[PDB]
Design an enzyme around this catalytic site. Sequence first.
Site, PDB file in Angstrom:
ATOM      1  N   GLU A 192     -10.262  -2.839  -3.614  1.00 58.52           N
ATOM      2  CA  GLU A 192      -9.447  -3.430  -4.499  1.00 58.52           C
ATOM      3  C   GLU A 192      -9.995  -3.999  -5.624  1.00 58.52           C
ATOM      4  O   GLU A 192      -9.384  -4.066  -6.733  1.00 58.52           O
ATOM      5  CB  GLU A 192      -8.297  -4.328  -3.602  1.00 58.52           C
ATOM      6  CG  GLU A 192      -7.097  -4.251  -4.173  1.00 58.52           C
ATOM      7  CD  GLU A 192      -6.257  -3.320  -3.399  1.00 58.52           C
ATOM      8  OE1 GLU A 192      -6.425  -2.166  -3.153  1.00 58.52           O
ATOM      9  OE2 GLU A 192      -5.155  -4.062  -3.000  1.00 58.52           O
TER      10      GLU A 192
ATOM     11  N   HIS B 282      -5.712   2.691   3.179  1.00 53.64           N
ATOM     12  CA  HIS B 282      -5.509   1.394   3.558  1.00 53.64           C
ATOM     13  C   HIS B 282      -4.372   1.195   4.443  1.00 53.64           C
ATOM     14  O   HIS B 282      -4.476   0.730   5.644  1.00 53.64           O
ATOM     15  CB  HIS B 282      -4.977   0.502   2.328  1.00 53.64           C
ATOM     16  CG  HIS B 282      -6.368   0.350   1.285  1.00 53.64           C
ATOM     17  ND1 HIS B 282      -6.170   0.135   0.124  1.00 53.64           N
ATOM     18  CD2 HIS B 282      -7.649   0.504   1.614  1.00 53.64           C
ATOM     19  CE1 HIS B 282      -7.552   0.010  -0.506  1.00 53.64           C
ATOM     20  NE2 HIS B 282      -8.295   0.333   0.484  1.00 53.64           N
TER      21      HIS B 282
ATOM     22  N   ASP C 205       0.770  -1.340  -0.008  1.00 55.49           N
ATOM     23  CA  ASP C 205      -0.015   0.005   0.105  1.00 55.49           C
ATOM     24  C   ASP C 205       0.780   1.119   0.002  1.00 55.49           C
ATOM     25  O   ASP C 205       0.435   2.072  -0.711  1.00 55.49           O
ATOM     26  CB  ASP C 205      -0.860  -0.094   1.105  1.00 55.49           C
ATOM     27  CG  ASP C 205      -2.184  -0.768   0.654  1.00 55.49           C
ATOM     28  OD1 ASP C 205      -2.839  -0.829  -0.383  1.00 55.49           O
ATOM     29  OD2 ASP C 205      -2.737  -1.702   1.474  1.00 55.49           O
TER      30      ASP C 205
ATOM     31  N   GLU D 124      -2.117  -5.887  -7.356  1.00 51.25           N
ATOM     32  CA  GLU D 124      -3.609  -5.628  -6.939  1.00 51.25           C
ATOM     33  C   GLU D 124      -4.359  -7.072  -7.026  1.00 51.25           C
ATOM     34  O   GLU D 124      -5.071  -7.351  -5.952  1.00 51.25           O
ATOM     35  CB  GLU D 124      -4.524  -4.619  -8.062  1.00 51.25           C
ATOM     36  CG  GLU D 124      -3.954  -3.225  -8.082  1.00 51.25           C
ATOM     37  CD  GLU D 124      -4.188  -2.416  -6.843  1.00 51.25           C
ATOM     38  OE1 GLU D 124      -4.435  -3.493  -5.810  1.00 51.25           O
ATOM     39  OE2 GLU D 124      -4.123  -1.395  -6.469  1.00 51.25           O
TER      40      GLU D 124
ATOM     41  N   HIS E 163      -9.999  -1.406  -8.232  1.00 50.76           N
ATOM     42  CA  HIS E 163      -8.688  -1.125  -8.613  1.00 50.76           C
ATOM     43  C   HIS E 163      -8.102  -2.152  -9.727  1.00 50.76           C
ATOM     44  O   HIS E 163      -7.459  -1.981 -10.615  1.00 50.76           O
ATOM     45  CB  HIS E 163      -7.677  -1.082  -7.675  1.00 50.76           C
ATOM     46  CG  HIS E 163      -7.705  -0.171  -6.417  1.00 50.76           C
ATOM     47  ND1 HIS E 163      -6.794  -0.006  -5.545  1.00 50.76           N
ATOM     48  CD2 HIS E 163      -8.823   0.821  -6.295  1.00 50.76           C
ATOM     49  CE1 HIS E 163      -7.257   1.079  -4.612  1.00 50.76           C
ATOM     50  NE2 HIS E 163      -8.409   1.145  -4.937  1.00 50.76           N
TER      51      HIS E 163
ATOM     52  N   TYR F 190      -3.803  -0.049   8.692  1.00 50.82           N
ATOM     53  CA  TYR F 190      -2.857  -0.922   9.469  1.00 50.82           C
ATOM     54  C   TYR F 190      -2.382  -0.292  10.725  1.00 50.82           C
ATOM     55  O   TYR F 190      -2.504  -0.925  11.809  1.00 50.82           O
ATOM     56  CB  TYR F 190      -1.819  -1.646   8.494  1.00 50.82           C
ATOM     57  CG  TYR F 190      -2.090  -2.039   7.005  1.00 50.82           C
ATOM     58  CD1 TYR F 190      -3.334  -2.946   7.332  1.00 50.82           C
ATOM     59  CD2 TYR F 190      -1.663  -1.368   6.089  1.00 50.82           C
ATOM     60  CE1 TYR F 190      -3.777  -3.082   5.880  1.00 50.82           C
ATOM     61  CE2 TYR F 190      -2.177  -2.230   4.732  1.00 50.82           C
ATOM     62  CZ  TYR F 190      -3.104  -2.909   4.702  1.00 50.82           C
ATOM     63  OH  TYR F 190      -3.698  -3.409   3.630  1.00 50.82           O
TER      64      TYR F 190
HETATM   65 FE   LIG Z   1      -4.771  -1.192  -1.083  1.00 48.76          FE
HETATM   66 FE   LIG Z   2      -5.237  -1.398  -4.343  1.00 44.15          FE
END
Ligand SMILES: [Fe+3]
Ligand SMILES: [Fe+3]
Lengths: 315, 316
Positions: A216, A118, A85, A182, A219, A122
């Site tokens: 995702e 994203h 990320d 991805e 993406h 975390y």
């Molecule tokens: Fe991501």
């Molecule tokens: Fe992504």
Amino acid sequence: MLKKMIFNEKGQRGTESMINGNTTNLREWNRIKYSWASDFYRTMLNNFWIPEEISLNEDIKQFPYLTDGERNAFDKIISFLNFLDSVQSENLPNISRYITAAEVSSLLNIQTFQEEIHAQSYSYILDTVTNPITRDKIYDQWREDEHLLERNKFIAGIYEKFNKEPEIHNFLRAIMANYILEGIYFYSGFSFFYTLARQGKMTATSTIFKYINRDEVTHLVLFQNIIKELKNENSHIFTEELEEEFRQMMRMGVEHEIQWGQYVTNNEILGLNDELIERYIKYLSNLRLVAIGLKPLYPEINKHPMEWIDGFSKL
Amino acid sequence: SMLKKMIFNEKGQRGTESMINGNTTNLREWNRIKYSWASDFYRTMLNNFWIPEEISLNEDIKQFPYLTDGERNAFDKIISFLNFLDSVQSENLPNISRYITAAEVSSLLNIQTFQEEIHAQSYSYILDTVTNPITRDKIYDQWREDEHLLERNKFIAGIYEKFNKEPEIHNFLRAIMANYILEGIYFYSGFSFFYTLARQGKMTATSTIFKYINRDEVTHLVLFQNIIKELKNENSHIFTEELEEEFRQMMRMGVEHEIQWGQYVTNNEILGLNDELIERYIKYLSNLRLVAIGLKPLYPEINKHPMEWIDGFSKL
Ligand SMILES: [Fe+3]
Ligand SMILES: [Fe+3]
Ligand SMILES: [Fe+3]
Ligand SMILES: [Fe+3]
């Protein structure tokens, strides 16, 4: 390849091509070339979410009770996904700068923002479920694990070749690398968190990953469609040997992800084993290749080995 | 002679060392940051999220055909200018961001870039809804027809493009100041037009969209205020007496340009605006903006707010 001007007063109205087009860079959403960019814009804004709005109170109680094998997989995976990320954060802008379709640039800018979210998620997970010293040693896994360091150099090296030497092929492999990232590297990571939540552990961080998974999917379709317009508009450089290069970038990425997933699970995660990991990644690579018009690498693997994931992953 | 950061730097250190020229990995680690103000800005920015199409324009559809010729003349030129502003912001921000060595600041600029894309789309949404396709495209293209608008555009884009093609530290700092001016001056001028229309009962839902944009703009202002403050502290040998005066002059010319543009598009035909009130408002804003980055005001003799009603009106 040279990069765009900030504003080109000599550009023509609308969007002419994906790369090398005579564009102004103005944002005019009712003068776009690619139809499909309009519905992705819409879907992406409707998917907005804030990680800190997802409560982790029950995962705080479960984290101290994960076995040492489950902690081993958790630490190395979440640190690797944070690396993915973050390089996407830095490289997406890099790719957008040569794209001459303003409506596509807009979608990559939305994508970049989503990656930042994203990565932040975390930080929210690690800072809430454990103490600062353990949080910092999870962030630093790449400094102490030789295998993880060399995945990082490899993945970053493809993007870095175009950052330092902007040539068409380099740009082209860079696009494929994104796609592989991805659709292959992240989907492996998701299946770990879904398998612990399936057993009742770390339920809430699994919720966070279903939001990440939902973004995702957009993406993936963004890059799928980007590759096919580029082929439609530059069919002389999409040679039989250039397409084979992509197939082989993909084979090589499959192999790495399989070897990596087996290394961090170490037959100590209940519900995954080395064979199941192998056929899942290969099966996913069959879907990813046909979606961009390329022949699969593993024609014998046609059935989904982990069908339960697709219902589980949805919100 | 600045240099572009790597995608990933394996030899970087943990945490953030400096704004520029620091030994960073580019990894996003929010619990190891140097600029503590970054945290709250992240939060605030995210909580300000909005979707332009969720605001209904039904009342503005009926009112658009009955705008005066003078109101339409002003409306067409301003919204095509603002669309140019956000478009260049969307293209330039990533160029600035790629030289920034504090990941927590780069995260914020990426969020900014995303917000600028939403702003630009808002404009497509307004024009496609309140008028027909042929009128819509004419407003988009107003810069191809109006020489004043075109020269402004070239001027503003040229400051950014001189860094884009020549990455040097002085060009970099002048571009940072350009951004600050753009957001704290050019945009504020445009907002007062739409609020002036809505105060009379015309194009009220268009004004609601501009309040959301205004809200985001405040955050962009404070972001650039802090970026400049840290750059000054960590690069004092570059921030000479003389370079701070060159920033003051950048603001002077921006102020001069914006007043003459505001006067040109309104042409004394917008009720509640006049040439002197526009003059006084822009100058008053520049005093606040310069103060906020530690510089002496250009127009100290204009100390009270000449259009006080705007502050309460612009709020949600
Ligand atoms: Fe991501
Ligand atoms: Fe992504
Ligand atoms: Fe804006
Ligand atoms: Fe802005």
